[PDB]
Amino acid sequence: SKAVIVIPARYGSSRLPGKPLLDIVGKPMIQHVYERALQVAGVAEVWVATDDPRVEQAVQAFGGKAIMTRNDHESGTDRLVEVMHKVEADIYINLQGDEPMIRPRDVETLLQGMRDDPALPVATLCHAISAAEAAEPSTVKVVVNTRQDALYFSRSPIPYPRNAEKARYLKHVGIYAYRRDVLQNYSQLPESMPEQAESLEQLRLMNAGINIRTFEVAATGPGVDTPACLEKVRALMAQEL
Amino acid sequence: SKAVIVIPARYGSSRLPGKPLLDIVGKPMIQHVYERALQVAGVAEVWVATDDPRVEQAVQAFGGKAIMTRNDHESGTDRLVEVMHKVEADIYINLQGDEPMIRPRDVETLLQGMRDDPALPVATLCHAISAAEAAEPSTVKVVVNTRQDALYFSRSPIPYPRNAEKARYLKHVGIYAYRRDVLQNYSQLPESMPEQAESLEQLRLMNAGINIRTFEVAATGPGVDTPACLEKVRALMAQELAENA
């Protein structure tokens, strides 16, 4: 069972052009993610999938592996499908190129889950959050069953707190592990009404009846999407030394 | 495949004491439901499950079948489990005793769905609603996949309207069809956190991985809960008797 980690690292960003190359305590952001990905046990290869020559050269400069992909992909999932054709593996793990504080252990929990159940098509992560945090539309909530399979993902606070003291909330952490057959069939899946309304791509999988198991980990570090988050992560990564 | 319809009809209610016995065009409410249930093709028997002798009596008075059940039942599904041990059937349909305007054709749609797929454990109904109606926590929303299987039921508006013009809402209609084996194994299922938080019994089934297929029908008639809507039903039911003359 061969697993590979793919890190989508597009150059562009509306608030932070050249995001993967931003310096964080002496190294470009993409290098931090790449180095942590290399510490994950059970992975055969780690690839940075980018759309810009500048990111590709930067990755090669530090000794990493990069693969050029199309600039017209709107989702990191479609970018992963392009890579699956070139890089053969049984399990593909998709890590965000803008989460330099990723814990290697969390990715191993995800991979273990896929290996423990060969019938599992997709796996992802989640962590507990307060009711106050669950009220925010920018935080994606997930509700799961006894086997930890996701019932639904939403920007609405679910479960609804009719009996507030009984509600427990989970935030979805956007890291995914996919079995190869899922990616081979991906392009044939139609967009779903819930996907379009919520603006959540993972709902395309659920619309088709593809199971997504969600493993719980401890609260994770923030991603870097705004210049404000960038300063926060820099300060956090600095004291972590 | 024998199917039976069970109508839970408990007397005691806070804002409407003796609700199933209320008069609508000269008949108790429970009688209107019973009479519509009899019009459903493919159903072998129709029963009223109650915990009160006044209701049992009222039912027998018009010639319907009543079965006394325990009053200590926490959930309406637990009441159906007790009936299941005594009344044999392959498929049990649970109709609400307070929706006199139920359309027989909708129950037939539900029954046909169960017969067309032998592996389906539970089926229920839903109809389209506007975004404004979906905002009320007293209305239960459901989101479904391509096979019409329910993904989740919630008092929260789902799907969340991030791109508002693309959202389409479905209201859950509380009529269920259960395969016998689901009811036999029901009492062993533990209550789930989403069920307790939302106060939605159907989430207990979803917690255990039991599939619930949800069939879409046209907007239903106003169920009787409040006296402002009771007069709407009285007027609507009366306008219906004059229309079918």
Please give the Cα distance from A241 to B46 (Å, whole number). Answer: 73
Is the CB of B154 inside 8 Å of chain A's CB atoms?
yes
CA nearest to A165 within chain B: B197
Query: Could you say which of B151, B155, B196 has the minimum Cβ distance to residue A152?
Result: B151
Compute chain A's Rg from CA coordinates. Answer: 18
Cα of A13 to nearest chain B Cα, Å: 21
Is the CB of B148 inside 8 Å of chain A's CB atoms?
no
Preferred mutation among B126, B147, B162 to probe A, highest tally of A CBs within 10 A: B162
Cα A212 to chain centroid distance, Å, stands at 13
Preferred mutation among B152, B155, B189 to probe A, highest tally of A CBs within 10 A: B152
Mind listing the domains of chain B with CATH numbers? 1-245 (3.90.550.10)
CB A114 within 8 A of CB A163: no
Q: Considering only CB atoms, which chain A residues are within 8 Å of B168?
A: 193, 197
- For A61, counting Cβ atoms within 10 Å of its Cβ (0-12 exposed, 13-18 middle, 19+ buried), the class is exposed
CB B168 within 8 A of CB A192: no
Q: What HEC string does A4-19 produce?
A: EEEEECCCCCCCCCCH
CA nearest to A167 within chain B: B197
Q: What HEC string does chain B produce?
A: CCEEEEEECCCCCCCCCCHHHCEECCEEHHHHHHHHHHCCCCCCEEEEEECCHHHHHHHHHCCCEEEECCCCCCCHHHHHHHHHHHCCCCEEEECCCCCCCCCHHHHHHHHHHHHHCCCCCEEEEEEEECHHHHCCCCCCEEEECCCCEEEEEECCCCCCCCCHHHCCEEEEEEEEEEEHHHHHCHHHCCCCHHHHHHCCCCHHHHHCCCCEEEEECCCCCCCCCCHHHHHHHHHHHHHHHHHCC
Cα of A100 to nearest chain B Cα, Å: 28
Q: Determine, for residues A198 and B162 on separate chains, whether the beta-carbon distance falls below 8 Å.
A: yes
SS3 A195: helix
Q: How was this structure determined?
A: X-ray
Q: Determine, for residues B145 and A209 on separate chains, whether the beta-carbon distance falls below 8 Å.
A: yes
Q: Determine, for residues A151 and B199 on separate chains, whether the beta-carbon distance falls below 8 Å.
A: no
